Amino acid sequence: NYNKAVEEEDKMTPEQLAIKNVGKQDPKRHLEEHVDVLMTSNIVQCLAAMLDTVVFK
């Protein structure tokens, strides 16, 4: 939901990228936060092998 809430602005971004491109008036990084979201998303992958070990032996 939050990622989509970012993406709706990301739809507005290529216009500005097609207009100015000089300087950054937006303090929001939009990157590292989503990276952290991926870090929280990696928990499933990391615990998958755990579940595999539990099931196996």
- Which residue ranges make up the site for other proteins (CB under 8 A)? 1, 3-4, 7-8, 10-11, 14, 17-18, 27-28, 45-46, 48-49, 51-53, 55-56
Q: Which of 1/40 has CB closer to other proteins? A: 1
Q: Which of 40/53 has CB closer to other proteins? A: 53
Q: Which of 10/20 has CB closer to other proteins? A: 10
> Max Cα separation, the chain?
60
